[PDB]
């Protein structure tokens, strides 16, 4: 005669603290759109599961997968590109939409998959004494490829007269920043947008989403699975000294 477990007995690893996004959220100055930090992230899990009770963002849209399926799909590469956009350009900015932004500075693969998270930064960007750190390239000699950056600051030569690195006739200055007008209305308030780019390929699947943990029973034979290794037995309490490692 064999006694089987009621439903199951499964235990998961410890807290396993998430990625150190606190430093990025609390960063005094976020990375500029033209120059965005690129640091590999691993040995952690996405923090979207804890955002149930928090500061809701303006929009959270995942075209590739539904918001509830994020925990059901493993992640390999986590790279977030944060930038600032104008409110009136939110409607004009979208995948598959032709426009000036899409043509020159916003270029991405047609099959790119990811999530878009937008939120109003007026609560923090306000009264910042109109810092001009943010900058962008309004015009360029060609279309920037994905994940590409331009380092050429030479004055663009439109006419036959050489610019010689200084302003002149038919000479254009490509680099430009978003003018901060204190009289800007609600619709002109800047909005911070983050796009998560990742292919989920070329790297091992190590990061997994949170999984619900059932209850534990003792003094009764039950199945268990620790670190992949499966077994069956009874879990009890022992006071025998054991090595910390």
């Amino acid at each position: 005669f064999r006694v089987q477990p009621t439903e199951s007995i499964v235990r998961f690893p410890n807290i396993t603290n998430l990625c150190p996004f606190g430093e990025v959220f609390n960063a005094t100055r976020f990375a500029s759109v033209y120059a965005w930090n690129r640091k590999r992230i691993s040995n952690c899990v996405a923090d979207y599961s804890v955002l149930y009770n928090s500061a809701s963002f303006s929009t959270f849209k995942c075209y590739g997968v539904s918001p509830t399926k994020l925990n059901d799909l493993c992640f390999t590469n986590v790279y977030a590109d944060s930038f600032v956009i104008r409110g009136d350009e939110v409607r004009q900015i979208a995948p598959g939409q032709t426009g000036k932004i899409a043509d020159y500075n916003y270029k991405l693969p047609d099959d790119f998959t990811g999530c878009v998270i937008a939120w109003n930064s007026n609560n923090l960007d306000s009264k910042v004494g109109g810092n001009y750190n943010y900058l962008y390239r309004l015009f360029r000699k060609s279309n920037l490829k994905p994940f590409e950056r331009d380092i050429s600051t030479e004055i663009y030569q439109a006419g036959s007269t050489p610019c010689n690195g200084v302003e002149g006739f038919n000479c254009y200055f490509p680099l430009q920043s978003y003018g901060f007008q204190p009289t800007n209305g609600v619709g002109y308030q800047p909005y911070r947008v983050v796009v998560l780019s990742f292919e989920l390929l070329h790297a091992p699947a190590t990061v997994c989403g949170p999984k619900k943990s059932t209850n534990l029973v003792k003094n009764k034979c039950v199945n268990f699975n620790f670190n992949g290794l499966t077994g069956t037995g009874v879990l009890t309490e022992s006071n025998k000294k054991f090595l910390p490692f």
Epitope: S32, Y132, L135, I151
Partner: nanobody
């Protein structure tokens, strides 16, 4: 205008290792891209290195590692190594300035600093 000059120089011993620290004192700084160029007789200006506003830095293979510049918290740290007699050249620094059209709408081109190696 920003003056990056720190000191005239000093004696250097064979196989030395000096890590100069920029003063980083003056007016309010800005997130402007920086470019480092090398000049010498018989050669024109070349794009030796380019460091962005903390995003990433690109350096030539010849100057990779042994000569480098790092940007951190609005501070420039130069790393100097592999000192040889042939390194005698002139360093040029190029920056980007937008709010400079009030009286001189021209780029702030710092004076080239000459460096020579001789025992």
């Amino acid at each position: 205008h920003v003056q990056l000059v720190e000191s005239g120089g000093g004696l250097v011993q064979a196989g030395g290792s000096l890590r100069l620290s920029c003063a980083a004192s003056g007016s309010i700084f800005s997130s402007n891209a920086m470019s480092w160029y090398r000049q010498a007789p018989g050669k024109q200006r070349e794009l030796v290195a380019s460091i962005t506003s903390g995003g990433n830095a690109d350096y030539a293979d010849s100057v990779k590692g042994r000569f480098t510049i790092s940007r951190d918290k609005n501070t420039v740290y130069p790393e100097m190594s592999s000192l040889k007699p042939a390194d005698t050249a002139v360093y040029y620094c190029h920056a980007v300035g937008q709010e400079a059209s009030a009286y001189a709408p021209r780029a702030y081109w710092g004076q080239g600093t000459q460096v020579t190696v001789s025992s």
